[PDB]
């Protein structure tokens, strides 16, 4: 049951990393990133599934979420669909301090908050998420 | 007629600043022992967000506005205008760092 979900989520993690590498290589070869958009519906359907949240936090899928959220070295931001889906998934899951320590998503969140090309609604949601994550540390 | 002191954030009438000085900033601006020059540069009549504080020590608002070490009274969230460079350098000579309350610095 839970082990099958863990195996499927790890397979999804490997597929996401492979798609990110392929899209980065294609961008370096002068081609648009299409693999991330193709994989986006399955990732969205998996993330919207509530009972898989414990398995996601066990398998540290937030690291690959950060990797997708990580801007490529050409200073080009990812597609708005990817950012919106990942932000909605982050809102829908109870991210704790231990999971943030494992994934290191705070750096990318601070980058999104400080950046100006990012949409102001995404900026406000990032500010809210940073405040909520700083809340347990001080009390 | 009322003005908001740029440094400490208190709000008092301009004639009160001229006659008696700022009760908190007198130790580093010498406002009680100064002309209308320092009153005009260190206090601004254009402000927003009137704040009344009763207990500086335990008010989180006072800590957030960095006014927990000052006299209770009328305070302003935002003050138009900044302190001049010479006054900033004079404060740095005293060892006190000036953080602007104009909102433009964060």
């Amino acid at each position: 049951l839970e082990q099958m979900q863990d195996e499927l989520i790890q397979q999804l993690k490997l597929q996401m990393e492979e798609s990110a590498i392929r899209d980065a290589n294609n961008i370096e070869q002068g081609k648009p990133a299409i693999f991330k958009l193709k994989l986006l519906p399955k990732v969205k359907d998996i993330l919207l599934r509530a009972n898989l949240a414990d398995s996601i936090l066990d398998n540290n899928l937030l690291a690959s979420v950060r990797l997708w959220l990580e801007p490529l070295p050409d200073a080009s931001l990812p597609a708005y669909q990817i950012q919106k889906v990942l932000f909605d998934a982050i809102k829908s899951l109870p991210i704790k301090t231990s999971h943030l320590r494992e994934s290191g998503l705070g750096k990318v969140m601070v980058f999104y908050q400080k950046s100006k090309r990012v949409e102001p609604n995404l900026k406000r949601t990032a500010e809210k998420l940073i405040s909520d994550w700083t809340r347990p540390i001080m009390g | 007629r009322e003005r908001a002191c740029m440094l400490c954030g208190i709000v008092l009438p301009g004639r009160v600043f001229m006659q008696n000085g700022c009760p908190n900033c007198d130790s580093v601006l010498n406002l009680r022992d100064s002309d209308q020059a320092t009153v005009n540069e260190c206090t601004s009549s254009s402000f927003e967000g009137l704040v009344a504080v009763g207990d500086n020590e335990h008010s989180w608002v006072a800590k957030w506005l960095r006014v927990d070490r000052f006299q209770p009274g009328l305070y302003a969230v935002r003050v138009d205008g900044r302190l001049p460079s010479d006054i900033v350098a004079a404060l740095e000579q005293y060892g006190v760092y000036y953080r602007p309350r104009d909102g433009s610095v964060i």
Partner: peptide, 13 residues
């Protein structure tokens, strides 16, 4: 500082 002054549960309401 400024970041440390964020509100906690024990701060006055």
């Amino acid at each position: 500082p400024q970041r440390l002054l964020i509100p906690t549960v024990d701060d006055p309401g």
